[PDB]
Design a protein around this ligand. Structure first.
Ligand SMILES: C[C@]12CC[C@H](O)C[C@H]1CC[C@@H]1[C@@H]2C[C@@H](O)[C@]2(C)[C@@H](C3=CC(=O)OC3)CC[C@]12O
Length: 128
């Protein structure tokens, strides 16, 4: 798949609570980044296993759906840059996360080398 197809397939996996499948999309040496992380969190997760250690916990703590996926037109199909919106619900709290993302994804042969995901960490600290 090209980068834009991988992005949309990745969002679909997360919406279904399938964090294992989402991590499976990364290259073994692939990198997840949160350039604007919530206080305390790392900004960079290197390697598929390190990413999985982090993401495996998500499905139990939160449910999410995405909307408004829009891509800017790049030159190379293995790069996608898109904005979208996520609406998460904390399972225990009932608290809600409403986030506008911008993402940069670099792919190589159907696997993710870089998934750079900008969001406003203030939306995380202020559930609704
Ligand atoms: C930073 C974050 C904040 C909510 C909660 O504390 C869990 C952490 C780790 C997990 C993290 C959320 C923020 C969320 O917006 C994420 C970035 C969200 C993602 C959206 C995305 O495309 O991939 C990941 C799913 C869950 C998420 O990966």
């Amino acid at each position: 798949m090209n980068a834009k197809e991988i992005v949309v397939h990745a969002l679909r996996l997360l919406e279904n609570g399938d964090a294992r499948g989402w991590c499976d999309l990364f290259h073994p040496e692939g990198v997840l980044e949160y350039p604007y992380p919530p206080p305390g969190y790392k900004t960079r997760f290197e390697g598929r296993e390190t990413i999985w250690a982090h993401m495996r916990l998500f499905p139990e703590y939160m449910t999410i759906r995405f909307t408004d996926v829009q891509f800017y037109e790049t030159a190379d199909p293995d790069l996608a840059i898109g904005e979208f919106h996520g609406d998460g619900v904390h399972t225990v709290s009932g608290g809600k996360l409403a986030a506008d993302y911008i993402s940069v994804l670099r792919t190589r042969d159907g696997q993710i080398l870089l998934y750079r995901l900008f969001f406003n960490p203030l939306r995380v600290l202020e559930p609704l």
